[PDB]
Design a protein around this ligand. Structure first.
Ligand SMILES: O=C(COc1ccccc1)N[C@@H](Cc1cn(CCNC(=O)c2ccc(S[C@@H]3O[C@H](CO)[C@H](O)[C@H](O)[C@H]3O)cc2)nn1)C(=O)NCCO
Ligand SMILES: O=C(COc1ccccc1)N[C@@H](Cc1cn(CCNC(=O)c2ccc(S[C@@H]3O[C@H](CO)[C@H](O)[C@H](O)[C@H]3O)cc2)nn1)C(=O)NCCO
Ligand SMILES: O=C(COc1ccccc1)N[C@@H](Cc1cn(CCNC(=O)c2ccc(S[C@@H]3O[C@H](CO)[C@H](O)[C@H](O)[C@H]3O)cc2)nn1)C(=O)NCCO
Ligand SMILES: [Ca+2]
Ligand SMILES: [Ca+2]
Ligand SMILES: [Ca+2]
Ligand SMILES: [Ca+2]
Lengths: 121, 121, 121, 121
């Protein structure tokens, strides 16, 4: 398993120790409070009222937790994933990223606490 | 495993099929949007800026997801629990509940989507 | 999970720390060498060529590993049980027992090493 | 998970659908009866009193169940593996094989029944 923090102001995201392999089943739980710039903080689903002005993941709100698996595009994580299998052809290291517009991460704050594990299959 | 929805306006909460027994390890993942009355909605961690004016769970924000195991006191769930063991002497059915002040659930709206499973132990 | 040894000469059996509850999935793996009296030893399936002269478990060979769950009847274990669910109304502590004829355990020797754990459900 | 059989008479062994990846935790349970030549049969631990005359696995008895992960050397399985991680950084398909001396499998008989699954990690 892996446990760590994902900082909101880290544009690169947080590379984890988890290599997603074909057939793997995973669980992710994410918690905490972060901001993309405003004084308010939001949980790992982000800000449901905020427009998309060029986010790295168009399928999750601004301030949401997302991931990449190896060379994949961004995939929503939000609060987590329960006994989840990736699309076919998706494999590699899991990188966790805060969802914001490229070049706008430097005014972000807080973080999410994240647990990842592989499940029975 | 149990998969379902917890309505914000349900004071009695949602009795699940999960009977937590001594030694069990569980995983919960919770998602979605709910309100305790205001226009805004919050995710399963609730509203970090709301005062506690007699919530059913003093250890989570207003609008958070919480639970009881049998006739335990309320236990915060928030976005979820990763490979979690309950406090000693706590056992019985898991009841999922929206965190609000008793008698004030009638103006609530939304729901959380929740998965629970027992893990290897 | 539980790990321990079950002596062949222990007519009362080896009580484990595992309480089997309704809906539990378990895994057991057993190894080692034991005898019901002859100088030969057998593994946890017992001796396939030995007649049943009044064994505690008529659905396992002489010298096999068997169990009781609470005060159930004997249930064969042999080399182990892979992601197994018990029969209806069976619950309680797992006791591991060597399969021999009652009152004839005194000339037994050796032991099996056993791992038990609970699986996802 | 994978369920199937491996013949005592097959030098090539039984290629499974399980691809063991770095970090994977697996469980194997094996059962059944086989001989490397004599009229007697043994379970998956093989014959503890037999000399090694050039077995494919020097770290298991003659008549034992062993395996390869990809093109690894042989690894003992015996009655099974409980929540086991591969000690060397091996990867690839699990191949199950009966432990005998190469060129001497012609007088072998029987088979083992095997379950393999990936565990939580
Ligand atoms: O839609 C609403 C209001 O409606 C609600 C609110 C609550 C409940 C229900 C409805 N949302 C807002 C009102 C609102 C809506 N709009 C239009 C959309 N907003 C913007 O144009 C807007 C654009 C950018 C930014 S902050 C800006 O965001 C960028 C990413 O997009 C970068 O990270 C950058 O670093 C950051 O500094 C902030 C606002 N502007 N204000 C609100 O409620 N304000 C209070 C602060 O939370
Ligand atoms: C002076 C005071 N304030 C606001 C203070 N905040 C409050 O005490 C306040 C309290 C409750 C509410 S909404 C209210 O919240 C309750 C839970 O606490 C119930 O869920 C109720 O159903 C809901 O309608 C909204 C605000 N602004 N200026
Ligand atoms: O009791 C004895 C010894 O008896 C003696 C011998 C001399 C003097 C006094 C007593 N034997 C014991 C233990 C024992 C002793 N030894 C060493 C002597 N045996 C051998 O070297 C031996 C070697 C090979 C074979 S069968 C032979 O095995 C090969 C792989 O090794 C190939 O698979 C081949 O295809 C197959 O045909 C069978 C026996 N191996 N096991 C036993 O367990 N036998 C079965 C009954 O319990
Ligand atoms: Ca920003
Ligand atoms: Ca309310
Ligand atoms: Ca005896
Ligand atoms: Ca042979």
């Amino acid at each position: 398993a892996w446990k760590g923090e994902v900082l909101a102001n880290n544009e690169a995201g947080q590379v984890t120790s988890i290599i997603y392999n074909p057939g793997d089943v995973i669980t992710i739980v994410a918690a905490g409070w972060a901001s993309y710039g405003p004084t308010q903080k939001w949980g790992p689903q982000g800000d449901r009222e905020h427009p998309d002005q060029g986010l790295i993941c168009h399928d999750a709100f601004c301030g949401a937790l997302v991931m990449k698996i190896g060379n994949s595009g961004t995939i929503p994580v939000n609060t987590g994933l329960f006994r989840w299998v990736a699309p076919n052809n998706v494999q590699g290291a899991i990188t966790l990223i805060y969802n914001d517009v490229p070049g706008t991460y430097g005014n972000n704050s807080g973080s999410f606490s994240v647990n990842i594990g592989k499940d029975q299959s």
